[PDB]
Amino acid sequence: MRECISIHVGQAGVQIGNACWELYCLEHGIQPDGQMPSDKTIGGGSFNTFFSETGAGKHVPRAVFVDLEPTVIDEVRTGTYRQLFHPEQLITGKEDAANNYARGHYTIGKEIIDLVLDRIRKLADQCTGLQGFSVFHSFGGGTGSGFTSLLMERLSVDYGKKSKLEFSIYPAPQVSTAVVEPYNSILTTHTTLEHSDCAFMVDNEAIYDICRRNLDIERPTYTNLNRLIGQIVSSITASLRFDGALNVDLTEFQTNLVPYPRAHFPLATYAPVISAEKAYHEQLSVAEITNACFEPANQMVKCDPRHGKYMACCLLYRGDVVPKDVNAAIATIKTKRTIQFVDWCPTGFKVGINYEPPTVVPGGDLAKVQRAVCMLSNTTAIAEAWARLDHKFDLMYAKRAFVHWYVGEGMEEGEFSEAREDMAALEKDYEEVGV
Amino acid sequence: DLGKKLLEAARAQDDEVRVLMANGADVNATDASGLTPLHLAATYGHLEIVEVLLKHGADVSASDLMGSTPLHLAALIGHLEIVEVLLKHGADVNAVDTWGDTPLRLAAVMGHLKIVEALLKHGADVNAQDK
Amino acid sequence: TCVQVALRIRPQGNREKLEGSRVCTSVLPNDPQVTIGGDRSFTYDHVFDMPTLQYVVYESCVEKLVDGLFDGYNATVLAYGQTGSGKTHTMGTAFDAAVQKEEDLGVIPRAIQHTFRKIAECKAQAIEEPAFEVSVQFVELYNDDVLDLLSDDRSIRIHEDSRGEIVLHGVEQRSVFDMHGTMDILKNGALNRTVAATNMNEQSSRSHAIFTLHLKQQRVAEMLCAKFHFVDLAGSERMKRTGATGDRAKEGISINVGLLALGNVIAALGGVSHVPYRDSKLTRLLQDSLGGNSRTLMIACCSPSDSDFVETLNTMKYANRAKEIKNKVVAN
Amino acid sequence: MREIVHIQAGQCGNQIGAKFWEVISDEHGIDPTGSYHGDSDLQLERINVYYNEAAGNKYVPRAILVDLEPGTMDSVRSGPFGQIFRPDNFVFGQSGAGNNWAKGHYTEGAELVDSVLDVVRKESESCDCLQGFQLTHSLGGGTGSGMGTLLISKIREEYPDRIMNTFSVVPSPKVSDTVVEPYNATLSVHQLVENTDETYCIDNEALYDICFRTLKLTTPTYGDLNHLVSATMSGVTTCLRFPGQLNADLRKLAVNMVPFPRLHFFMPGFAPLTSRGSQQYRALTVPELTQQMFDAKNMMAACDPRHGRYLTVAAVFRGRMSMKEVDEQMLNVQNKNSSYFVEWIPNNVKTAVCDIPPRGLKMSATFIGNSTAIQELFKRISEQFTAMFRRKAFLHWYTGEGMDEMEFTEAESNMNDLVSEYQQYQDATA
Numbered sequence A: 001m002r003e004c005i006s007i008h009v010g011q012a013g014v015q016i017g018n019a020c021w022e023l024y025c026l027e028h029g030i031q032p033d034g035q036m037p038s039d040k041t042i043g044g045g046s047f048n049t050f051f052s053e054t055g056a057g058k059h060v061p062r063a064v065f066v067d068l069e070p071t072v073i074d075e076v077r078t079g080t081y082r083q084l085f086h087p088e089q090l091i092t093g094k095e096d097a098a099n100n101y102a103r104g105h106y107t108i109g110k111e112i113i114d115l116v117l118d119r120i121r122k123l124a125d126q127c128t129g130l131q132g133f134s135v136f137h138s139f140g141g142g143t144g145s146g147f148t149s150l151l152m153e154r155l156s157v158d159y160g161k162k163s164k165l166e167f168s169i170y171p172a173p174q175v176s177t178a179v180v181e182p183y184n185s186i187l188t189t190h191t192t193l194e195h196s197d198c199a200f201m202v203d204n205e206a207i208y209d210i211c212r213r214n215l216d217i218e219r220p221t222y223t224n225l226n227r228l229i230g231q232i233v234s235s236i237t238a239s240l241r242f243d244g245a246l247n248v249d250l251t252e253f254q255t256n257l258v259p260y261p262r263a264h265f266p267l268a269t270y271a272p273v274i275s276a277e278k279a280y281h282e283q284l285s286v287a288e289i290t291n292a293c294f295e296p297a298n299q300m301v302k303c304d305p306r307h308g309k310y311m312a313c314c315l316l317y318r319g320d321v322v323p324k325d326v327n328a329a330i331a332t333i334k335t336k337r338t339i340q341f342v343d344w345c346p347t348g349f350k351v352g353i354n355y356e357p358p359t360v361v362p363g364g365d366l367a368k369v370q371r372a373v374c375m376l377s378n379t380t381a382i383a384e385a386w387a388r389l390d391h392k393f394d395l396m397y398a399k400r401a402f403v404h405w406y407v408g409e410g411m412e413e414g415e416f417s418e419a420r421e422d423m424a425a426l427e428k429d430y431e432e433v434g435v
Numbered sequence B: 001d002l003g004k005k006l007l008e009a010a011r012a013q014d015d016e017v018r019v020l021m022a023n024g025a026d027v028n029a030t031d032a033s034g035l036t037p038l039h040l041a042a043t044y045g046h047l048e049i050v051e052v053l054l055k056h057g058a059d060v061s062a063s064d065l066m067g068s069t070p071l072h073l074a075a076l077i078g079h080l081e082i083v084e085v086l087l088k089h090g091a092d093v094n095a096v097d098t099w100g101d102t103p104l105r106l107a108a109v110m111g112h113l114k115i116v117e118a119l120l121k122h123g124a125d126v127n128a129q130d131k
Numbered sequence C: 001t002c003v004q005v006a007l008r009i010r011p012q013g014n015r016e017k018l019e020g021s022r023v024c025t026s027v028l029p030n031d032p033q034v035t036i037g038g039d040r041s042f043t044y045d046h047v048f049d050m051p052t053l054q055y056v057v058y059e060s061c062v063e064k065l066v067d068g069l070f071d072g073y074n075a076t077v078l079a080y081g082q083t084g085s086g087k088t089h090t091m092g093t094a095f096d097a098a099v100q101k102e103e104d105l106g107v108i109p110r111a112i113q114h115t116f117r118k119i120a121e122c123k124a125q126a127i128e129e130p131a132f133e134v135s136v137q138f139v140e141l142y143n144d145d146v147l148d149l150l151s152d153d154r155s156i157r158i159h160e161d162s163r164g165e166i167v168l169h170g171v172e173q174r175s176v177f178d179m180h181g182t183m184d185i186l187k188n189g190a191l192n193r194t195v196a197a198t199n200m201n202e203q204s205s206r207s208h209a210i211f212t213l214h215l216k217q218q219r220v221a222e223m224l225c226a227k228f229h230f231v232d233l234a235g236s237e238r239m240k241r242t243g244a245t246g247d248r249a250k251e252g253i254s255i256n257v258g259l260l261a262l263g264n265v266i267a268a269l270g271g272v273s274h275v276p277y278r279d280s281k282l283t284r285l286l287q288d289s290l291g292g293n294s295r296t297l298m299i300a301c302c303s304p305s306d307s308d309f310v311e312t313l314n315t316m317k318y319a320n321r322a323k324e325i326k327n328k329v330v331a332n
Numbered sequence D: 001m002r003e004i005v006h007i008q009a010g011q012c013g014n015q016i017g018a019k020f021w022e023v024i025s026d027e028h029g030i031d032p033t034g035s036y037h038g039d040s041d042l043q044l045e046r047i048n049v050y051y052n053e054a055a056g057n058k059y060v061p062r063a064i065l066v067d068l069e070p071g072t073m074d075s076v077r078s079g080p081f082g083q084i085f086r087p088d089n090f091v092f093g094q095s096g097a098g099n100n101w102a103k104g105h106y107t108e109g110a111e112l113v114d115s116v117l118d119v120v121r122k123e124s125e126s127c128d129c130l131q132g133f134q135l136t137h138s139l140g141g142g143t144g145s146g147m148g149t150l151l152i153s154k155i156r157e158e159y160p161d162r163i164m165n166t167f168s169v170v171p172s173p174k175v176s177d178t179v180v181e182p183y184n185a186t187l188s189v190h191q192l193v194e195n196t197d198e199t200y201c202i203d204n205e206a207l208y209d210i211c212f213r214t215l216k217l218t219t220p221t222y223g224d225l226n227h228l229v230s231a232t233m234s235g236v237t238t239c240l241r242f243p244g245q246l247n248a249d250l251r252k253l254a255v256n257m258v259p260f261p262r263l264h265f266f267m268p269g270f271a272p273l274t275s276r277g278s279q280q281y282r283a284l285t286v287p288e289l290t291q292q293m294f295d296a297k298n299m300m301a302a303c304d305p306r307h308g309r310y311l312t313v314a315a316v317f318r319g320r321m322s323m324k325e326v327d328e329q330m331l332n333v334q335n336k337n338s339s340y341f342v343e344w345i346p347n348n349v350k351t352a353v354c355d356i357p358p359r360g361l362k363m364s365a366t367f368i369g370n371s372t373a374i375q376e377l378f379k380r381i382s383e384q385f386t387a388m389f390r391r392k393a394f395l396h397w398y399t400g401e402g403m404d405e406m407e408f409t410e411a412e413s414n415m416n417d418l419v420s421e422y423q424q425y426q427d428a429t430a
Ligand SMILES: Nc1nc2c(ncn2[C@@H]2O[C@H](COP(=O)(O)OP(=O)(O)OP(=O)(O)O)[C@@H](O)[C@H]2O)c(=O)[nH]1
Pocket: A009, A010, A011, A012, A013, A015, A016, A068, A069, A096, A097, A098, A099, A100, A138, A139, A140, A141, A142, A143, A144, A145, A169, A170, A171, A172, A175, A176, A177, A181, A204, A222, A225, A226, A229
């Protein structure tokens, strides 16, 4: 046991964390009111470190949900789960950050940042050990991009010792709510970079397409993406909840996945994505779901890993997975496929297995599979996505289009040209470790 | 000077117009602009005073220092009556002020469709746009 | 027929030294180029290093401009750079109650004494004295209001002249006759400049000040008018370093918004069909300084320390392109 | 941000602004008495944006009613919904403004403001979270152009951090042949440029030509022009009045729409074009609600959108349809016609949707564009202004009123600059 605290920032952050704790609760047979059937309690030696036990056997997530507007967390406060979360954990303001990074980091954020700190203080002062924080946010939202970076700066001076993991949305036009999201994404990345140890980005388009052919949803809603996204987050946080072999500590994510400090953005790939529509479906062997982890249609960020060099792999299996067959599949990626590693780095593939049957949402679109997997490659080929984003940014910054909203909201013009040049250095960072 | 005062009566006073002319005041007096009383009466709408001035020797085509004829001005403001009266007394339609325009274009630009018709009868030009 | 840029690096301040900051800028002896953080380099018309005294600044680039006034040629000197990098001290738009003058006197003051010496220097002659009318106006733009520093305030307006130039209507334009009295209006105007403290400068300028000197001359074969603007800009600020809040931080935003609009104006002139002068009142007030019919020096002010690096980079990057800007000058 | 304060000034403004209140009250289910009788919970969900609640579950709008003449506010009390408006928020005087900007801005009305402001203050201290304000006014001259651009200025120094938007009807010869009108527009446009965060350009020239050559209505009334107007103030506000994701508040819409601080003028657009005659042709082509909005002949401003480039578009489809042919066919308009959208603003066309349409219509779109075509609007008022100015025609109605010739020259510099700024971005590259 050593605890983890979840902070969910901004609309995407809150609705994805809501889907996450929904799936977490099902996975340990906890009910939407905190209570658990004694059928599923143990003699002490309950390895829920994401959950806190209180008298009368209510289990209360170690989570803070923060939005600068009240509407989304209002829909957490009166839904199925008004019971799970303590209200202190659910902080809102009244005026949002009108898709403006500077509102969140510089003006409207600075007015709610102390109260968040001191509530997140109450979750921390109740932990015996503590590892740090899992922080859920969006790149294109105003609060998502802007307030998150303000929280990271300050969770890093308080709790400077503690580890910081972020799950980050990467915007797609098919669900863009705004035109400055490239501004917002390069802004939150520059200011947060120095304060995150690992960051799994979720391309809303990658997910949107997976939902379109694997589940055959034609016009997916946030409720489809979150169901599916809530999956891959649970594969990540499987170990931190189930006393597992790999990634036992938050530090070991940084240990295994991220050798070099700035290049800390792995590529999560997931399989099987199987629809609840399909009438009969022959479950997929370990060997099958491991070869799908190398099919670019299943990763959660669009890029060509073949054009890039690997520098760390971990594969996380769940369910009816026998350890011998894992190594048969792993030894055959090393021969049926050509997977190059950094000129200077150990070749290997860490493995974890979880033995618990993958849970899906009952009456949702994902079909209960028998053995799933989630590989976390860290490729140089993810630099491809940073380029997409950088170019969109460049197109507007050439014209100083929209900048005057940011400078009027706390920013200096040079911050734009600065944040953009951190990126120019980073695309050079991914250029030099590989090739 | 009576001429100054007849100029101010045409801008405004039909009674005081013919009382000031019978005192020997200059029909074709000018202000610093160069505007004669027939100017100031065809802008600001006064039909009677427009004809009074013309039965007593007004230059119907006198320009001001920026080349404004009485019908230039009368077209701009509307005032189709004053444009017709001004036309029968020998007014130039195809005349040009210092800006390059014609009483046609001044009537196009301002939308006085009733007048652009009348203007086009007695003479158009090719400076303006096709419409 | 083209804008002069001069860059002036200050000595490291007490914060900087006592806090471990260290020099990354490098100029060579009698060299119009500068080098920063090792790699990245720029050349200007002048570069005055960290020990350059006030009078060295004046002679090298501003003495010519004040002359040209008597030749009916308008001029501009605007200081532009980061907070605390020496704008106000260089310009001479600030005065300390208890230091003394002690020489060390900025552009504006030395410009006064220059004017009043070449006037009498011209009045000496055998062919009968030319008469001069020297006047001054002195405004600050504080949070998008043009305030008059020459008066008992509480408005004003900005319009274009007959020749198309920018005139301020409703600003006091009082006439002066010798050094001592032109000087005393400069002190009582600076007494009214809005100034307050940020962590970056204990006397931070919360506005942009323009000291405009007017000199209409009449002599024998004619009449020669020429304005001369002295713009002491507020420096760009970052809320994390200033520590600003409320009334303070609001000032810092409206400063940044106008320096934004000055940025794009510099870029459009060089860097094409339109030039965004109307984005800020600041850039309207500077529309002839950068557009044309002024002779313009930009004095760009720079911390030498590396704790002010990326900032000095920005200042330098605009300063560099500003050299490319075509002023179109005619004698009035 | 929750709640919007609406003010209506002038004859025109008070007339469109009351049709506004009339139409959206239908969409929301508030009847003239203020009781709710609608058939949805979707209508009541965000009702507080334009209405306050009261004793008895009554809903009274947030409008101030402003006029220097009473004759337009005695007749609105005598209209269908003049009952519901609060009585203390009727702020008439008697002077009139003689269709003069100066008379509204400086002489008369400068005495009636600071009375308007005192109820503006009133309804706004009741606000949990103020979005800003919308004004319905006319640019054509008088109590709406001069007091209107005085209210907007005095409201900005008091609530600087709130969004200002206007529905600003633009004068045309073709509708009112009032000689003195290009003067009062160039006096208003000068103030709208400085002090509004977004302006809708309801242009009476466009409304005339739609009512005559598209609807075939040979003698167009103020009712038939206003019908087209109220259908537009329903579309361009629906995002604010129903639950949704895109351009949901005044500040978020501004940040999607205004790239450069001064270019905050939008031309609306509406499909399907309808008359009050109430003949409803629908399904006569259905996906092409996308080609109708994007057409010149459906704009509410006398501009051919093909004569320039779009900067930020906002399409809002109302009704019961497929959010999936909407997507495909809105992606087609952008990739048939690729040059008509600037490139240095990627993904510049945003597409919302709503599930309740207005009455009359099974399906309807609405269009909010920041096109550089808009300069045909200002160049038109520029030429008609410069005609009247060069000749000093009628200039003493204003100098007489404590104005000055430099306001005139200044106001013409501003809008002419506006024109060339729109024209730089209509032609930029790489
Ligand atoms: N997967 C997923 N993406 C979302 C969700 N909500 C918003 N997004 C994405 O988030 C981005 C917008 O950020 P928001 O979270 O809505 O903005 P915000 O954090 O609420 O901050 P404000 O701008 O102040 O309202 C867009 O790119 C959307 O694609 C969600 O529930 N699930």
